[PDB]
Amino acid sequence: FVPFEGIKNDLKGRLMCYKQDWTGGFKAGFRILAPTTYIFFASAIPVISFGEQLERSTDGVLTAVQTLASTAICGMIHSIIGGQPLLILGVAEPTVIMYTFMFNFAKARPELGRDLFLAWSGWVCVWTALMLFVLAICGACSIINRFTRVAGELFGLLIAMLFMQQAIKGLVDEFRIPERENQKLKEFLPSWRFANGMFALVLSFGLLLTGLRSRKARSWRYGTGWLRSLIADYGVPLMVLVWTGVSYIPAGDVPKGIPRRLFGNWTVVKEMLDVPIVYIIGAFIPASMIAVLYYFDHSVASQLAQQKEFNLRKPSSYHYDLLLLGFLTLMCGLLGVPPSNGVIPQSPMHTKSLATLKYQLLRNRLVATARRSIKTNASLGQLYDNMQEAYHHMQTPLVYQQPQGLKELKESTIQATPVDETLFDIEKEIDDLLPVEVKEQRVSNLLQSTMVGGCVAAMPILKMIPTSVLWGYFAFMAIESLPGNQFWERILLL
């Protein structure tokens, strides 16, 4: 717990894999788009829902534009100078709850009111940034190492329950009347309300089930490998588009709003000095709560994306990441947008998608090399050496760790068997000798953040998405927030 020690160590570690990060990201060509698109959807949909929730709960002060811009800018800055580019930054539910509490507090004060809410929030963000700077400088993130696997599994389960509760609440609200829309409307009759609720159930469950099914496309006996990979990669975005199209089928026999549909930044510094100084000090309290929450969430989200099972080859940056989070919180407060923060399950989902990308790249390369070798000599031990050489050649040269390397050829595999091709199937055998590796780089995070930003200018296209799609996706992400963690497995076994 020495001042500035952790930050300096983290910077030392990360500054020697920076150009490597960028060149590795560019090494993959357009194949980097699949994880990028997957994480872009996973980041944009919850943020848009949170933006709608804040617009309803803040009388139009904060909308989806602000949440999207915060997510995009914070993500881009973290991608370029972050320290741990696996982390995905976004506006989380606890932030929404705290901002709702703050808005409710400020609406009941004649001194603050509604036209000074953003300025008071900015002062809260200044206090939070100061607290985060103090915590990072003192190495308070060292206690993160102490928290064990259960301390992260419980948080994952809590986030899963929160996402499921959000999905169920959205589905139930599809059955009720909104508190802001015109009450005397054709689309809001009890019969049409029941119809809307049932249609939303159909669409949400259809999206959930089809996406969960298409997530297993690669392990199918039908179709071609190209089509199987395309489905396994883009099924959830494709399902979003397909169920959006399905929602338009009955449009010739229903009222306008059946089903219900969805719908830069500025500065608040000038009016930030108009807040009386009894609430600038009073911002310390919600600032303390938000600082503790962010200290916990950023760290746990970063460590859940850095599981030992992924065999990552680059160091962690907990202290430096917390310092940068302080800076980003200060910037977001000055810009009048809610702060971003490391979020789950987006971060582990990003890590898993990158691991899958590396696995597929390696499988393609090794299959090609094995097929090339089968024709020439194919001695089954000289071909394994060729595959090992290709694996080593593909890898990126670093200084910290070394590539895991292909694992041992199983005794049963050799006992079963130049090499006879009838008795040695490459597709069956490659999977048995591929390690778990992650394609670590900064390009996927940067592109996902830029896409989230461009969603700001793509609002008319976003106007065509029903909210049932959002609730189905929230359920899909809640299930993704327990992708087979040890704690959930143990609960299943009991």
Side-chain angles (χ1 to χ4, degrees):
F1 298 104
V2 191
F4 290 103
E5 213 198 34
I7 299 169
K8 255 135 64 180
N9 291 7
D10 296 337
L11 269 177
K12 278 166 60 266
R14 293 308 310 207
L15 262 168
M16 38 191 57
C17 44
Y18 198 80
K19 180 188 188 357
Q20 287 114 296
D21 276 319
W22 287 112
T23 56
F26 294 134
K27 217 155 46 153
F30 293 106
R31 263 217 154 251
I32 199 96
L33 286 173
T36 299
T37 305
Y38 190 70
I39 300 310
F40 151 68
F41 268 79
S43 149
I45 284 154
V47 152
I48 282 157
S49 156
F50 299 151
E52 300 256 307
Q53 186 178 339
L54 276 168
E55 191 191 30
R56 284 182 258 115
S57 80
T58 65
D59 311 291
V61 174
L62 290 171
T63 78
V65 174
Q66 275 79 64
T67 55
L68 278 170
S70 178
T71 307
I73 300 141
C74 284
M76 300 212 235
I77 289 174
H78 174 77
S79 98
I80 298 180
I81 59 174
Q84 178 49 254
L86 288 168
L87 243 189
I88 298 303
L89 259 65
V91 179
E93 182 63 26
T95 301
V96 169
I97 296 160
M98 268 308 288
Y99 257 61
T100 305
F101 282 144
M102 287 150 45
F103 183 82
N104 285 331
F105 174 84
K107 193 174 26 171
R109 316 292 319 173
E111 286 119 295
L112 293 178
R114 170 206 195 265
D115 259 35
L116 253 49
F117 156 67
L118 273 181
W120 188 58
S121 277
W123 278 117
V124 165
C125 284
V126 163
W127 277 111
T128 310
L130 289 194
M131 311 213 180
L132 293 167
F133 290 155
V134 169
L135 284 174
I137 284 158
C138 267
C141 269
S142 305
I143 301 158
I144 301 312
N145 307 2
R146 249 173 244 151
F147 277 29
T148 91
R149 180 70 58 107
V150 305
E153 273 166 347
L154 271 158
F155 195 61
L157 171 81
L158 250 56
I159 292 296
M161 266 147 65
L162 221 73
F163 270 94
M164 206 42 105
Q165 178 203 297
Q166 189 112 357
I168 289 161
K169 202 67 220 77
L171 289 179
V172 167
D173 273 326
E174 291 290 320
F175 276 97
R176 314 256 168 263
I177 191 84
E179 72 282 310
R180 302 170 94 212
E181 308 212 62
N182 187 354
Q183 266 67 32
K184 303 302 113 210
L185 269 169
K186 187 159 182 271
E187 37 265 40
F188 290 108
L189 268 67
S191 86
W192 279 125
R193 276 188 330 171
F194 197 78
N196 179 72
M198 285 304 173
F199 197 11
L201 273 173
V202 168
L203 287 176
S204 85
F205 266 95
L207 172 87
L208 173 66
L209 298 174
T210 55
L212 281 175
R213 216 84 58 117
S214 79
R215 281 254 95 205
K216 309 155 176 322
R218 285 231 172 69
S219 98
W220 287 351
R221 307 165 38 240
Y222 327 91
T224 89
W226 149 272
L227 187 60
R228 291 225 290 300
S229 48
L230 252 71
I231 297 175
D233 274 348
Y234 302 94
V236 190
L238 269 156
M239 276 317 94
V240 166
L241 210 161
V242 160
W243 287 104
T244 304
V246 167
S247 69
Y248 275 97
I249 290 171
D253 335 294
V254 301
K256 245 56 56 177
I258 300 301
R260 293 178 193 166
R261 305 273 180 210
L262 255 174
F263 312 107
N265 44 62
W266 218 339
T267 179
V268 300
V269 154
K270 194 234 189 274
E271 86 193 359
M272 198 149 128
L273 312 170
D274 292 332
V275 176
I277 174 154
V278 190
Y279 298 99
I280 296 179
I281 292 120
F284 188 92
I285 293 168
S288 320
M289 290 148 55
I290 297 170
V292 161
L293 256 161
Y294 279 14
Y295 164 80
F296 191 80
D297 290 350
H298 209 63
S299 307
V300 171
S302 201
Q303 90 179 16
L304 279 194
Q306 297 176 66
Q307 302 273 53
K308 46 174 287 311
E309 73 223 50
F310 288 126
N311 304 307
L312 300 179
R313 287 175 72 203
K314 278 153 186 176
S316 60
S317 330
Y318 289 109
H319 313 90
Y320 175 72
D321 275 354
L322 203 69
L323 193 87
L324 184 60
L325 178 63
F327 272 111
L328 290 171
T329 296
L330 169 65
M331 181 203 68
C332 275
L334 289 174
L335 280 177
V337 299
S340 283
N341 154 82
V343 280
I344 55 161
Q346 282 95 332
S347 296
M349 276 161 54
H350 189 218
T351 306
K352 290 170 211 139
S353 72
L354 293 171
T356 296
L357 165 68
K358 203 170 188 319
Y359 193 97
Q360 292 306 314
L361 261 48
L362 187 45
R363 190 224 183 71
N364 280 2
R365 193 78 196 81
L366 287 194
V367 164
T369 50
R371 291 237 145 105
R372 172 249 290 141
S373 298
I374 275 175
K375 162 144 60 184
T376 346
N377 288 117
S379 171
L380 206 257
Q382 173 185 303
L383 176 153
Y384 182 81
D385 301 348
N386 280 17
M387 298 200 311
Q388 199 103 53
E389 188 166 3
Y391 170 101
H392 284 316
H393 190 113
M394 269 218 309
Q395 294 320 280
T396 294
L398 305 173
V399 309
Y400 329 96
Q401 291 261 61
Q402 286 295 106
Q404 299 268 300
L406 302 194
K407 41 187 69 168
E408 150 162 31
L409 209 41
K410 267 78 163 173
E411 172 122 23
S412 69
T413 41
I414 47 168
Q415 210 72 356
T417 287
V419 51
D420 51 352
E421 319 89 30
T422 176
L423 208 60
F424 197 72
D425 212 56
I426 314 135
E427 267 68 5
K428 189 182 140 208
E429 296 300 326
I430 294 320
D431 304 1
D432 282 327
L433 69 154
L434 281 188
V436 182
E437 287 177 346
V438 184
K439 168 75 119 171
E440 309 169 73
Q441 33 70 52
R442 302 171 111 91
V443 168
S444 65
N445 207 328
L446 174 69
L447 288 180
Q448 165 259 346
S449 313
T450 310
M451 290 156 105
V452 170
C455 266
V456 168
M459 281 300 174
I461 301 287
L462 291 182
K463 287 175 193 280
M464 302 156 150
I465 299 167
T467 54
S468 27
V469 151
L470 268 65
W471 314 135
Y473 198 83
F474 264 72
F476 171 86
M477 273 192 93
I479 298 171
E480 232 55 34
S481 193
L482 37 85
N485 45 328
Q486 217 68 26
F487 179 86
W488 177 244
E489 303 265 17
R490 269 195 279 111
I491 294 309
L492 280 163
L493 299 171
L494 179 97

